[PDB]
Design a protein around this ligand. Structure first.
Ligand SMILES: [Cl-]
Ligand SMILES: [Cl-]
Ligand SMILES: [Zn+2]
Ligand SMILES: [Zn+2]
Ligand SMILES: [Zn+2]
Ligand SMILES: [Zn+2]
Length: 251
């Protein structure tokens, strides 16, 4: 398969995988217009849409896409049944698309019903995991997001993190506000700053690298533990997650 990105709105990406014949899988199409344009420009043959969660910026384009291409199957969680899903998927299920079996992983936190899709190496993790960050907890608890990120981080090292928003630079500025001396975070911040200064996409990222630069994946890293403890004594990695997530909310 071949990966493509379609920008939408201010900072969304609509990921598309295509096979050699041009059949395609479209992930979280919040705006149909750039998707329809890309389908036509590339002569793609739409097969499926994957939805990760119910927010407008991920689902708004479904109706128009399926009107133009009624053959599309729309896979999504129960919380998207009223957003155009025609095949519900749940934790531990799979969807067979473009000749590949995608695993479905429930990741409550950003929304309660958020799911991620994985077919090695591609991880479509929506708004759960971002490069350098994680989703805001609009519906779920910090415990849920902590457990969700633990599952995603346990995927293979070569996983390509295909998240939905170009938030990487802001995420790294937050990281430096917590760990200003951390060399890996500083180096990745500079790389990202330069990509964005040239208007270049920062995604996808390799999970092995991501774990080293993402404070939300580092709650057992002694360096982060120690810096947090200079302000608030915390012994549980899950507590460090909630402390970080609340700090980021205010940043
Ligand atoms: Cl809104
Ligand atoms: Cl978010
Ligand atoms: Zn393959
Ligand atoms: Zn969202
Ligand atoms: Zn909104
Ligand atoms: Zn979003």
């Amino acid at each position: 398969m071949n990966l493509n990105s379609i920008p939408a709105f201010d900072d969304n990406y609509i990921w598309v995988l295509n096979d050699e014949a041009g059949r395609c899988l479209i992930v979280d199409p919040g705006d149909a217009e750039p998707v329809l344009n890309a389908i036509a420009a590339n002569n793609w043959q739409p097969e499926a849409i994957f939805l990760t969660h119910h927010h407008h910026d991920h689902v708004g384009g479904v109706k128009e896409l399926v009107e133009k291409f009624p053959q599309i199957v729309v896979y999504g969680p129960q919380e998207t049944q009223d957003k155009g899903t025609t095949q519900v998927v749940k934790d531990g299920e799979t969807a067979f698309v473009l000749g590949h079996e995608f695993s479905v992983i429930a990741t409550p936190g950003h929304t309660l019903g958020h799911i991620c899709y994985f077919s090695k190496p591609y991880l479509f993790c929506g708004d759960t995991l971002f490069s350098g960050g994680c989703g805001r907890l609009f519906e779920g608890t910090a415990s849920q997001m902590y457990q969700s990120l633990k599952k995603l981080s346990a995927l293979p090292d070569d996983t390509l993190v295909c998240c939905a928003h170009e938030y990487t630079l802001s995420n790294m500025k937050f990281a430096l506000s917590i760990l200003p001396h951390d060399l890996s975070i500083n180096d990745y911040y500079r790389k990202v700053k330069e990509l964005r200064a040239k208007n270049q996409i920062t995604l996808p990222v390799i999970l092995k690298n991501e774990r080293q630069i993402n404070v939300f994946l580092r709650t057992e890293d002694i360096d982060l533990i120690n810096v947090i403890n200079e302000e608030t004594l915390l012994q549980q990695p899950e507590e460090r997650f909630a402390w970080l997530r609340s700090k980021k909310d205010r940043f």
